[PDB]
Amino acid sequence: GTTENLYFQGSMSRITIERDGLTLVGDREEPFGEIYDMAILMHGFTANRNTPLLRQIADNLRDENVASVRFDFNGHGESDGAFEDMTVCNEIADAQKILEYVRTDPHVRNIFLVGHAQGGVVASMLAGLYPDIVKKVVLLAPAAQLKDDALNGDTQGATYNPEHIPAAIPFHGKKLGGFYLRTAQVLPIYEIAKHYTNPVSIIVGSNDQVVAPKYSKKYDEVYENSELHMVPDADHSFTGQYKDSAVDLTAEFLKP
């Protein structure tokens, strides 16, 4: 009475890519098979490509025969660049080189974007710039609030005059670029995101203490083909018990 139950199948690769003289470091996960859809997974502000959330997303996508790549943004994790030089704009430039890496790959069928938080802002504006290429987008707690906070001169507790932004501000151990804050103020987030008319899923925790729920709702009102999933009680980063519910909504939207 022997049983055998397959739970893991495929390949995992450490990838490096160049953007303007910076090395970006990523992990590629593929299922077995010559052709597969491929998701680009994008982390949040001060996070990295190997959060529990993004690992579990790559794992459950692979179970559904969907490949994934997840890169450290410039100034984060193992990728090059000073944290203080990172902006939402140069993270969009990182994501574009990753999209070109994937679009050029002979194994790939359709390209999906998955962005958590600031990674969700990046994903939404990349999709707006490549709506001909991106087939599905998942936004998790997309952090469009970073624009309103930069305009109000209050970024998660760090205060500054929004009309005389310093060169850099102290931020929880780190140095946040004046340029991050000046570009955040004028980011055409919703203006660019609305060019993407293909399917979008927006996943938000009811208990998100970092980004107000209003931001996710505005994405839902601006997208032609959106669904909005409010996960009861979930936190900002979908941690512990809330990880599984974000992963299940992601995998179920992207699966063949």
Add this chain to the structure above:
Amino acid sequence: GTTENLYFQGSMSRITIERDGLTLVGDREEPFGEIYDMAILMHGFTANRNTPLLRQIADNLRDENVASVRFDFNGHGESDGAFEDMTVCNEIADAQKILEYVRTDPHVRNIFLVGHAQGGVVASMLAGLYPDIVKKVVLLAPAAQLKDDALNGDTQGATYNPEHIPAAIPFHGKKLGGFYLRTAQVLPIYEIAKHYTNPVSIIVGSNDQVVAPKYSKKYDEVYENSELHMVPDADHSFTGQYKDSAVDLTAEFLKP
């Protein structure tokens, strides 16, 4: 009978600066003195920092005791980076590192921007992001048309589907990045430039056949404190006779 006519006084330095792991190469010109105003001079699309126009502007500013720096943008002249990776966005990032270099210099009093054509677009966007820092701006045939052309699918004769832009398009023997064109299409040129309320002088040739002078008129309408100088018969580049008129209006506006 003795005559003495001074025709050159100051210091010229070759500068290099880093932006995201790219070296940018520039020429710095100063007059004699411990404290001076400093103009950042910004070249156009496929040009470099040593066009006749920009050398003569640096020369005439130094005679009026105004220092200047002129850098090759990424993908141009002697600077790092492939032409095909250049966007308007990453030239604004180049210009921000130049602004930081100049703003950090103990000799520099007030900072002026001077931008020709695409350089004018860059200068206008940087001034909008740093309206608290930039004291004067001169735009010479600012090429805000690059947005409308990208949306039309016709960039100086290079044609493409504006909703399915290729990875790169052949462009006068070089390769122009798809990302240049997709970001050109959504650039909030006038919306960002508007935030600059200090003095601006806009210098346009009535016979510009590369950028419609209407784009310079639009800047004049958008700015709080602008003057418009339409140079009868002058071409896009301000070649020959037209160079002295462009130089003279620049030096007159910035002089102490």
